[PDB]
Amino acid sequence: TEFKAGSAKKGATLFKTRCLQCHTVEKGGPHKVGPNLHGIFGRHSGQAEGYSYTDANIKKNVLWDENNMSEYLTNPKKYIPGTKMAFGGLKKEKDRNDLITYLKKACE
Amino acid sequence: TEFKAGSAKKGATLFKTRCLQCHTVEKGGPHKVGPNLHGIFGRHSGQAEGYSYTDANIKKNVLWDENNMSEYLTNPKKYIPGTKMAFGGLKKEKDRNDLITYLKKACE
Ligand code: HEC
Ligand code: HEC
């Protein structure tokens, strides 16, 4: 790709410190501020039921792959202008590789 | 995406006339000229076991999503220079949408 595997353990702690405030990853996990992300890989943006997405996310219709996800995480608002996800971004590719490695695994 | 759903039925007949000569889609289907494609979506290129891929496909490490797949099908050799897949391409987006619609479904 333009994405390579990292440390899932490192990625777990990245999740906890940077994403857990708003999201769950487990199957049967609830929506919070943000939507539960189980099964995100391969699904298009805006399709978790019971969550109120912005117009912007839905119409962006991103197919979530480890690769798209990387560009998204760099700068969410640059990627989906108008998203209400209030997260600045993960500028280091190594951080993103770690986190996505952990998401790839925990969201299946 | 930059890909929209079409006719899975139309996509089935596209498969039969243009891809079936070399590939199977069913779970438990054999490799032929080309590899069995069950589960292709979300997997990287070159990872079906028991198939002898070209150096080119493997190192290209494409993550197969309905979207990548479209660009691939336009012109396989332009996309993976050196691939031994001898298929010229499906130039009409509508044809590709139909076929991918059918693959999305039959390869799960
Ligand atoms: C609250 C301050 C957030 C933090 C921190 C993170 N996310 Fe988030 N995310 C949040 C919201 C409110 C939304 C909805 C956006 C909208 O415009 O509707 C999102 C969305 C996602 C998505 C898209 C999900 C989809 O189903 O399309 C993803 C892939 C995502 N968020 C991932 C994620 C990760 C991995 C984070 C840690 C770096 C993270 N988000 C932080 C809110 C919040
Ligand atoms: C024989 C003349 C082919 C026809 C017609 C089609 N494909 Fe093919 N495909 C063929 C080969 C020999 C290979 C291997 C390529 C190599 O360089 O190793 C491929 C590969 C694929 C792939 C990649 C699979 C992977 O696991 O990475 C895909 C996605 C694919 N072929 C799809 C496919 C479709 C949908 C076709 C009909 C339009 C099709 N191929 C035609 C051989 C032949």
Domain boundaries, chain B: 1-108
Provide φ and ψ at B37, rounded to 5°: -100, 10
Q: What letter does residue A61 receive in the DSSP assignment?
A: -
B61/A contact by beta carbon, under 8 A:
yes
DSSP A63: B
CA distance B32 to B1: 31
Q: How is residue A104 written in tokens?
A: 């790839």
Give exposure, B67-104, as e/b (b: 16+ Cβ within 10 Å). bbbbebbbebbebbeebebebeebeeeebbbbbbbbbb
DSSP state of A44: B
Let me know: does A94 contact A60? Beta carbons within 8 Å.
no
Ligand that comes closest to the CA of residue A87: 1
Q: Which residues of A touch B101 (CB under 8 A)?
A: none
In the block, tokens 């199957």 appear at A27
Q: For atom 17 of ligand 2, which residue has the closest CA?
A: B83
Give the largest CA-CA distance in chain A: 34
Name the token pair of B104. 């999305």
Resolution in A: 1.2
* Long-range contacts of A9-17, Cβ-Cβ distance < 8 Å, separation of 24 or more: A9/A102, A10/A98, A10/A101, A10/A102, A11/A98, A11/A99, A11/A100, A11/A101, A11/A102, A11/A103, A11/A105, A12/A102, A12/A106, A14/A90, A14/A95, A14/A98, A14/A99, A14/A102, A15/A99, A15/A102, A15/A103, A15/A106
Closest CA to B106 of B2, B31, B12, B5: B12
Determine the distance from the C-alpha atom of residue B100 to the mean position of all C-alpha atoms in its chain, rounded to a whole number: 8
Say which ligand is closest to the CA of A68: 1
Could you tell me if B63 and A69 are in contact, meaning their C-beta atoms sit under 8 angstroms apart?
A: no
Handedness of CA A78, A82, A85, A86 (dihedral sign): positive
Distance separating alpha carbons of residues B38 and A53, to the nearest angstrom: 32
Residues of A in contact with B63 (CB under 8 A): 1, 3, 65-67
| Domain covering A1-108: architecture | Orthogonal Bundle (1.10)
CA distance B63 to chain A (A): 6
- Cα–Cα distance measured from residue A21 to residue A33, given in angstroms and rounded to the nearest whole number: 8
* A24 in contact with ligand 1, CB cutoff 6 A: no
Name the burial class of residue A37, with classes exposed (0-12), middle (13-18) and buried (19+) by CB atoms within 10 angstroms of its CB: buried
- Please name every residue paired with A44 in a beta bridge, in sequence order, or none if there are none: A63
Take residue B43 and report the two structure tokens written for it: 């997997």
In the block, tokens 């693959």 appear at B103
Task: Specify the amino acid at residue A47.
Answer: Q
Between CA A50 and CA B2 the distance in angstroms is 26
Sign of CA dihedral B83, B87, B92, B95: negative
A87 lines ligand 1 (CB under 6 A): yes
Interchain contact A79–B (C-beta under 8 A): no
Q: Is B45 helix (H, G, I), strand (E, B) or coil?
A: coil
